[PDB]
Every structure is written in structure tokens, then in C-alpha cells.
């Protein structure tokens, strides 16, 4: 439930605003969820789909 444009916005914002060269997978998840929350709101389908995508790999 995330197209190419929204994917780029979410992960570009996560990288540039929230991540460091030593960030691990746990922090990537926190950064991606927060970035999608910034862009689309905490109750959005975008946040739900990001959460689930990381939930899928047990993180």
C-alpha cells in the first residue's frame, strides 16, 4: 500500500532526518515509521503499511 513516490519520500526522509552510518535495523524501523508519521499522520494507511512491512521480518 505504498507507491514509488511515497516510498521515496518516506525513505529519503528517514535517511536524511533520522539515520546515521551506524544505524541498525531497529533504528531503521523507528526512522521509517516516524518519517511516514511525519508525512502522512500516525493513523494513516502509509504508517500502517510501513509498520507491517517491518513487522513481517520480526523487528
Amino acid at each position: 500500500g505504498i507507491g514509488r513516490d511515497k516510498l521515496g519520500k518516506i525513505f529519503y526522509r528517514a535517511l536524511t532526518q533520522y539515520l546515521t552510518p551506524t544505524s541498525n535495523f531497529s533504528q531503521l524501523r523507528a526512522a521509517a515509521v516516524q518519517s511516514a508519521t511525519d508525512l502522512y499522520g500516525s493513523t494513516s494507511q502509509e504508517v500502517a503499511s510501513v509498520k507491517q512491512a517491518f513487522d513481517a521480518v520480526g523487528v
Binding site: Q17, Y18, L19, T22, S26, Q27, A31, Q34, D38, L39
Partner: protein, 342 residues
């Protein structure tokens, strides 16, 4: 004999560590040539006269002539470690956001068992060479009284449960004074070893605005002065066109911050800009920007709070990954270098 300035003009070493006497305008040549891919995240001057330790990838290195000669001591378990000096010829190597933790006693390397698999800071008690302290990425401090042999949790979480903590920086004069930085949670400060934390203000220009604090460094020359790297997340609201990145300065030990440097082409900042406060002048902060990209090289910046301006020097290396100061002549700066081009 005590600490002295380096008694050389050229460094016998593999190229990972050099020194400058003029704030980076000239760098001492090294016999060896640094090779891709290389980082030197670990570099400290010890209290032992003329002795430094460095980690060049997983190679632990040592100098006993104040940086004129560097020799391999051991291979560490991690290829990416930071160094924290302890009193009496001792240091701790640790991987930031990793689990590796080891002690260096002179030339002896002892693997330790970290109480955290995601270490975001380490501090030593200069009055008790066995008292070492460690922070995990949830914001938990851990205390040890046996040179890191065994550990126990200490105090409460810097930002409460569920937080992602980028850093905990310990005051080198006092392990009980620490600054923590987190994701959206801004900064916190403790003066009692993690028993109570106070939330910092001033990282966002908007009252109560969210912020990130990626890195902080307490001035070795004044416990009240703290330099920090962070982002004003209100300024960096979606669609704003601003990343909101600044360097900050506190004069109350980490309770309140003021912006001192903005992210511009003249002073370029990233989420991992190295902070190197002067060990003798609380007004002065060194920081860096470097990139392989387009062979730009490396700027070594120097901020002076007396005037609020930033000067810089430039070298051709891909980056400066670590900085230490000669304790006898702090105008002599040791630089650990990066080479990353493919």
C-alpha cells in the same frame, strides 16, 4: 620524562594517523599510504607519557613516542571501534551501535562481555580507574567497578521506555554527569548517574518542538559547556525545504542549548559530524566535513565562542574519523583518517 610534542617531521605508520600543529593547514607526512577501505574511529591520548592508541579498521595500534611511530598491537574482534581512555594506561574499545567491548591495559587486550548489544556511549572515572560506565540504545546506563569484568544496570531510562537513543556522552571529569540524545526526544541531562533525567530545551526554535540529538561532547575544560549536533524537527517539517541541522552549545551542562552553527555550504553538517571540543579552551570546538564525492576532500572547522565565527582548513583526505590532542602541547592535534573511494 612527561608528555612532549612529537619529535619528528614525518610519521612512521601505515597512514591512518597523522598530526598537525596549525589546525590542519599542514599534515605530517606518513611513511605508509592509507588504503581503501579504511576508517580510524578510535584514537585517544593516554595519561601514560607520550602514549596513544588507535584502531585502524580492526587493527589496534600504539605509539609511545607521541605519535612519531605507530605499531600494530593486536587485531580486535570488530573492524569498527571507538576508544575511551581510562586512568593508568588503560582504554576501552567499543563498537558504536554494536556489541563488541574490550579493555586495553597497556599492550594487553581483554575481550569483555557487554551488558548491551547496541552500545551508544562509554565513560571512565578518572578518580577510580576501575569505575567504567556504559550506555545502551534504549537509554539504560550500566555501571562496573571491576574494569568491565561484570556489570549491573544503573538509574532509569534517559527518555523512558520505547526510545531510540543515538548517544550518551559522559563528562570526562565526572561519570555522574551525562547527556543523552534521542530520536524525536531531543536531549536529556543527568547530574546523578542516571537516577533522574531532565529534558533539555533549545534544540528546537519552537517551544516544545521535537528534535534529534545525534552527538554531544562535554568540554574537557568546563563541565558546564556541552557541544551537540542535532536537528530541529519543527524547522525540518515535511515540505519545508530545510533539514533543520545545527551545531548547538550549552553553558548550563546540558539543560538548555543555543544554535551556534548552521548547515550551509560554508559549514557542512551531517547526522554524524565529528565533534572535538578543545581540551583546554571551553570556547573552542573542532568539527569536520569530508567526502570522497568529486574528490572534495576534508574541511577541518574551528568554532570560537568568543566571536561565534568558524574558520577552516582543508586537506585532500576523504575524511577525518577521529581527533585527539597532545596534552603537553594541545595545539598539536592527532587526526585519524578515512579513505573510502572505490
Amino acid at each position: 620524562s612527561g608528555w612532549r610534542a612529537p619529535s619528528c617531521t614525518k610519521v612512521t605508520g601505515d597512514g591512518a594517523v597523522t598530526f598537525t600543529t596549525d589546525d590542519g593547514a599542514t599534515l605530517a607526512p606518513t611513511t605508509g599510504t592509507l588504503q581503501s577501505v579504511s576508517y580510524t574511529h578510535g584514537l585517544v591520548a593516554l595519561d601514560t607519557p607520550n602514549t596513544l592508541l588507535a584502531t585502524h579498521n580492526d587493527e589496534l595500534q600504539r605509539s609511545t613516542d607521541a605519535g612519531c611511530t605507530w605499531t600494530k598491537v593486536a587485531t580486535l574482534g570488530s573492524g569498527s571501534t571507538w576508544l575511551t581512555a581510562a586512568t593508568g594506561g588503560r582504554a576501552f574499545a567499543w563498537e558504536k551501535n554494536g556489541g563488541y567491548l574490550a579493555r586495553v591495559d597497556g599492550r594487553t587486550v581483554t575481550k569483555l562481555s557487554s551488558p548491551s548489544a547496541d552500545i551508544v556511549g562509554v565513560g571512565t572515572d578518572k578518580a577510580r580507574r576501575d569505575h567504567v560506565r556504559l550506555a545502551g540504545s534504549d537509554g539504560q546506563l550500566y555501571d562496573s567497578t571491576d574494569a568491565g569484568a561484570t556489570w549491573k544496570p544503573l538509574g532509569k531510562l534517559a527518555f523512558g521506555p520505547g526510545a531510540s537513543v543515538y548517544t550518551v556522552s559522559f563528562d570526562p571529569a565526572d561519570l555522574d554527569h551525562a547527556v543523552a540524545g534521542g530520536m524525536t526526544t531531543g536531549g536529556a541531562v543527568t547530574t546523578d548517574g542516571g537516577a533522574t533525567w531532565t529534558a533539555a530545551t533549545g534544540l528546537s526554535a519552537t517551544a516544545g518542538g521535537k528534535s534529534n540529538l545525534f552527538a554531544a561532547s562535554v568540554s574537557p575544560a568546563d563541565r558546564n559547556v556541552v557541544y551537540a549536533l542535532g536537528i530541529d524537527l519543527v524547522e525540518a517539517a515535511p515540505n519545508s525545504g530545510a533539514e533543520g541541522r545545527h551545531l548547538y552549545r550549552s553553558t548550563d551542562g546540558g539543560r538548555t542549548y543555543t544554535r551556534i552553527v548552521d548547515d550551509t555550504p560554508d559549514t557542512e553538517l551531517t547526522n554524524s559530524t565529528l565533534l572535538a571540543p578543545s581540551p583546554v579552551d571551553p570556547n573552542v570546538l573542532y568539527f569536520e566535513y569530508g567526502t570522497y564525492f568529486q574528490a572534495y576532500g576534508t574541511d577541518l572547522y574551528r568554532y570560537d565562542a568568543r566571536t561565534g565565527k568558524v574558520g577552516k582548513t582543508h586537506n585532500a583526505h576523504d575524511g577525518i574519523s577521529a581527533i585527539a590532542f597532545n596534552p603537553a602541547r594541545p595545539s598539536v592535534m592527532y587526526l585519524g583518517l578515512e579513505e573510502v573511494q572505490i
